[PDB]
Amino acid sequence: MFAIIQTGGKQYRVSEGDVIRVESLQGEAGDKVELKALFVGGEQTVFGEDAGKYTVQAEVVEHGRGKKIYIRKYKSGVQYRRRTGHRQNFTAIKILGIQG
Amino acid sequence: PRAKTGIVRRRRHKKVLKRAKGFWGSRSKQYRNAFQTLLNAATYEYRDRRNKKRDFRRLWIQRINAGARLHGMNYSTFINGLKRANIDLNRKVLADIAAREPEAFKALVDASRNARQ
Amino acid sequence: EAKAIARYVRISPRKVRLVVDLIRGKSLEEARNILRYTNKRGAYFVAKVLESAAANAVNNHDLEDRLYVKAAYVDEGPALKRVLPRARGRADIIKKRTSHITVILGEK
Amino acid sequence: MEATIYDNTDGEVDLPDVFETPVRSDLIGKAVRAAQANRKQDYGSDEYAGLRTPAESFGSGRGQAHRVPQAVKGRSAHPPKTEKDRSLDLNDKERQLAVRSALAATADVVVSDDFEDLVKTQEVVSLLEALDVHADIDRLFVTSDEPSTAARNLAGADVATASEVNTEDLAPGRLTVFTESALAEVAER
RNA sequence: GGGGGAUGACCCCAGGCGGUAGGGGAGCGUUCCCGAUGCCGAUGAAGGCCGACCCGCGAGGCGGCUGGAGGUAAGGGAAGU
RNA sequence: AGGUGGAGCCUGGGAGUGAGGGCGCGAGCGAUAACGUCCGCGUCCGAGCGCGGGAACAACCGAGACCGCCAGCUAAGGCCC
RNA sequence: ACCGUGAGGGAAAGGUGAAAAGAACCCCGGGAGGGGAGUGAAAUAGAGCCUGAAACCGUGGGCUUACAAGCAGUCACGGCCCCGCAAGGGGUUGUGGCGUGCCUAUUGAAGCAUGAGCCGGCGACUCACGGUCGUGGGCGAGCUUAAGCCGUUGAGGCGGAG
Numbered sequence A: 001m002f003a004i005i006q007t008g009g010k011q012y013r014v015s016e017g018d019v020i021r022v023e024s025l026q027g028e029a030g031d032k033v034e035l036k037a038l039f040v041g042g043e044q045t046v047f048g049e050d051a052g053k054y055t056v057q058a059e060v061v062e063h064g065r066g067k068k069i070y071i072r073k074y075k076s077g078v079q080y081r082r083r084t085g086h087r088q089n090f091t092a093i094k095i096l097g098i099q100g
Numbered sequence B: 001p002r003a004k005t006g007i008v009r010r011r012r013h014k015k016v017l018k019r020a021k022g023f024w025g026s027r028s029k030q031y032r033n034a035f036q037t038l039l040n041a042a043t044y045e046y047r048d049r050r051n052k053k054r055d056f057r058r059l060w061i062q063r064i065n066a067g068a069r070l071h072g073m074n075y076s077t078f079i080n081g082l083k084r085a086n087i088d089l090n091r092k093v094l095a096d097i098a099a100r101e102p103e104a105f106k107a108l109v110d111a112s113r114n115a116r117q
Numbered sequence C: 001e002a003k004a005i006a007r008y009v010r011i012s013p014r015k016v017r018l019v020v021d022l023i024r025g026k027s028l029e030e031a032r033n034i035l036r037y038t039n040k041r042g043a044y045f046v047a048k049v050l051e052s053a054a055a056n057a058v059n060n061h062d063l064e065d066r067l068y069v070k071a072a073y074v075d076e077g078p079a080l081k082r083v084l085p086r087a088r089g090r091a092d093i094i095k096k097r098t099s100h101i102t103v104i105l106g107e108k
Numbered sequence D: 001m002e003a004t005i006y007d008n009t010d011g012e013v014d015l016p017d018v019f020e021t022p023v024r025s026d027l028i029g030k031a032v033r034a035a036q037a038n039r040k041q042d043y044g045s046d047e048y049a050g051l052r053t054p055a056e057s058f059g060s061g062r063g064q065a066h067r068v069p070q071a072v073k074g075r076s077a078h079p080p081k082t083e084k085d086r087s088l089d090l091n092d093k094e095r096q097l098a099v100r101s102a103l104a105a106t107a108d109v110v111v112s113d114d115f116e117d118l119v120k121t122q123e124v125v126s127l128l129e130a131l132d133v134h135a136d137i138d139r140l141f142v143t144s145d146e147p148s149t150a151a152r153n154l155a156g157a158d159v160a161t162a163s164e165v166n167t168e169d170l171a172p173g174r175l176t177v178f179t180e181s182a183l184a185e186v187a188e189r
Numbered sequence E: 001g002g003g004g005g006a007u008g009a010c011c012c013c014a015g016g017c018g019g020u021a022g023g024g025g026a027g028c029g030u031u032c033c034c035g036a037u038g039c040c041g042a043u044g045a046a047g048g049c050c051g052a053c054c055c056g057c058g059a060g061g062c063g064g065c066u067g068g069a070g071g072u073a074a075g076g077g078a079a080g081u
Numbered sequence F: 001a002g003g004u005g006g007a008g009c010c011u012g013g014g015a016g017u018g019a020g021g022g023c024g025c026g027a028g029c030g031a032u033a034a035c036g037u038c039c040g041c042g043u044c045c046g047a048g049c050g051c052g053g054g055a056a057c058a059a060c061c062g063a064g065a066c067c068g069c070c071a072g073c074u075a076a077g078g079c080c081c
Numbered sequence G: 001a002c003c004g005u006g007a008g009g010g011a012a013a014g015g016u017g018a019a020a021a022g023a024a025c026c027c028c029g030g031g032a033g034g035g036g037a038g039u040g041a042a043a044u045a046g047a048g049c050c051u052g053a054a055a056c057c058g059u060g061g062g063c064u065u066a067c068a069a070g071c072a073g074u075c076a077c078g079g080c081c082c083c084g085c086a087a088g089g090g091g092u093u094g095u096g097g098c099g100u101g102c103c104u105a106u107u108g109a110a111g112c113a114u115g116a117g118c119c120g121g122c123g124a125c126u127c128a129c130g131g132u133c134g135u136g137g138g139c140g141a142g143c144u145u146a147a148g149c150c151g152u153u154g155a156g157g158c159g160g161a162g
Helices: B008-019 B035-050 B053-068 B078-083 B102-116 C013-018 C028-037 C043-061 D025-031 D099-107 D124-130 D183-187
Strands: C002-004 C102-105
Touching: B008 B035, B078 B102, C002 C043, C028 C043, C043 C102, D025 D099
Parallel strands: none
Antiparallel strands: C002 C102
């Protein structure tokens, strides 16, 4: 149940535990949706093969939710008379690891 | 046209204060260096803000070595061989593997060594 | 359990402090000889605030002896802002830091 | 247009190009404005005190630093300067103009002269039940030359005159009536 | 800036974006005057005390405890902010 | 001519500093002496031209800091600890 | 009040409650002050007794502390402790990892240059008449003094020297 493909960014090493995933506001909207995610890390049941052997099949996961920035603050300061403050961003829509 | 600013400033401070965990003996409530200490901490975090992601670039660096060598070689070998790759290129996760799934790792470890020599 | 106390108490909060910090959490009767035969002032006092303590209870807070002092403390407040020799020009006052005196008396 | 005539079942009067027209919010308020204005009051903080006493701001080379402001209750810094020119004389044209278009806004309500006669603030409870609602809520008295007697008193007073009864007047949100002689102010218009 | 914007907004890419005196634009709370066919509150005015929803933000909202009586303005105005 | 692309010109309101140094080079002085000063050509810093390097070191080599902690190639500079 | 021989200076300090019903009596105690009862909607509303924040002194508890450096700290990983926004976070830190405070004036500043011990409240680009550009808008000949009259609200409207 544990695979490791890679999206518009590695963000990988999963199977089912839906992994908070980088944005993608074009296919996402698709609530609990289905979509393909190229592989390149075939690790299943103690059997592996090139991430280049893979680059042929893959998987897919249901477009779950839209995590809302998990808090995180950025005190932008310095002795040099320069301050300011902006809170987290990076969310993301969640989605389970549809393995195959 | 009275301005008893009052109630207001006080608040603000509270503000920061919060910004005021329970850090070091004092500032603790240091309605100053209180405030200060802040500014500091801040920017800090910042630079830390971007920092980390580095501290990582390395972390894996070793945990990596831990293996990359294990078998018998370094990360200027591997690497080179790796990029000999073609439909498979990654590094991060690689590590946290070699340790997670020995076989898996072990694997590539080969396909690698080879790619190379 | 019950308790004794008294503010507007002229004395070295501090000093006081040692006071209990001894007889502290301990058998009634027992310390009741600590302060009876200890030393430094406060004692006297300290003692006092143990009797209307032991009292109050049994009397209106009730089981004798089996008692003691689950806890005891003192606080400062009201000061006594005191004027002294004008820097031979400007005033220099100290402060007999008033003194509170609470102290528990609960039963074993 | 829909120059509705009171007495209701009776006649209807015409809408005078004047009122008709469009609107001009800007001036709108403005009219307003040049209202409260010339109509507020004034104030300030002591001339004597705030610059009242002697002062020995103290030598120096001692441990200090220095009858002026910045140590308590005293001074000010630029306060109520009663000498605070309050007026604001809008401008004629300006004004008038307002009321106008202003009123225009009013149109969006016809007081038969014949009323310039009714003689009791309970004859209002009447010509009342005639046509009430919420706009009446507003209301807004006014006869034509010499006010609508008793009509002037109640729980909505205010009796302009075919002359004297501008925006300050009702202009505000509001809703009211004018005795012909009233539209004698229109002439003023 | 530019390709159509329905009021939003959406798409491309060009295109940067470190900045003190200092120049231009935009917003935030503070005590007051409207009550532009505005009024909440003894089952709390407000200040206080504490917080892992809303905002780039300066603030908001909102819920728990406190406390004895107020005052809030959906919008424009004013200033001892 | 112009590949460029985004500086240019006039009218007009609001300004700030009106005394700087550091480095390379070409000159002046100077014991071709000084982290000396004095003029020039480019850069440099400007209390943030914040980060990398050279141990540490504005500053000299590379670099232009909108924001994204567990991506990828390199610069200068390095890879026995 | 208070310092000044004098002329003169010249402060601080208001708030219980609906009303006293303002705490008879009993308790330890020389008392003050503390324990009960009683008023009471509440007395942690209780006699300088409304709200009564901070600084600062206490009393217990969680975590933490004796081969260890820096105000800071913030990034990583770990154990104990609680999960009224539970498979995610709270708090505390053992290590290690990268780190020179903060303000004015400065060519240049960690600073060993100065500014400040700590907290709370006051405390610093304003108003008027002119002039000056820009803009929101009313007529292009545009526009009003002072005053006369009208004025719960008090309603502006006439005034034509300039």
